Design a protein around this ligand. Structure first.
Ligand code: VO4
Ligand code: VO4
Ligand code: VO4
Ligand code: VO4
Ligand SMILES: [Cl-]
Ligand SMILES: [Cl-]
Ligand SMILES: [Cl-]
Ligand code: NA
Length: 129
């Protein structure tokens, strides 16, 4: 599913991401924009052989099981395919784990490089949430 900006913001807020671990909703929407372009089906292989999955590009190196990431963990205790669903619940639940791990949203390199420090409120501007 390719979400619209305001549709995703509304879904993220419903699922409890707004100000989760202090990160305003626009941070989450910005991250998803640059990680996946709001496409729940996005997948991208990493150099180390892991893969990133879904709207928030969660990595098989640590967080989910895809059966082809040697030596990896599955800390969210899910199959990586679950992160590609049209319903964002599994991705949100896992993202809450990740953001709580110690480095906040710096876990998402696109967030640090493209969202951090910017006017992230723009991402939810005009939205009926
Ligand atoms: O997040 V709503 O669907 O106020
Ligand atoms: O395509 V991945 O480098 O962890 O974002
Ligand atoms: O021993 V278990 O971490 O799923 O509770
Ligand atoms: O309630 V679903 O979020 O699992 O629409
Ligand atoms: Cl957009
Ligand atoms: Cl694996
Ligand atoms: Cl933080
Ligand atoms: Na894994």
């Amino acid at each position: 599913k390719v979400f619209g900006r305001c549709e995703l913001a509304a879904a993220m807020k419903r699922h409890g991401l707004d100000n989760y671990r202090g990160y305003s909703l626009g941070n989450w929407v910005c991250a998803a924009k640059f990680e996946s372009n709001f496409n729940t089906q996005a997948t991208n292989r990493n150099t180390d052989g892991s893969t990133d999955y879904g709207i928030l590009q969660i990595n098989s190196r640590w967080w989910c099981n895809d059966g082809r990431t040697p030596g990896s963990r599955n800390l969210c205790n899910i199959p990586c395919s679950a992160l590609l669903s049209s319903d964002i619940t599994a991705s949100v639940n896992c993202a809450k784990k990740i953001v709580s791990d110690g480095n906040g949203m710096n876990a998402w390199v696109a967030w640090r490089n493209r969202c951090k420090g910017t006017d992230v409120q723009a991402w939810i501007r005009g939205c009926r949430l």
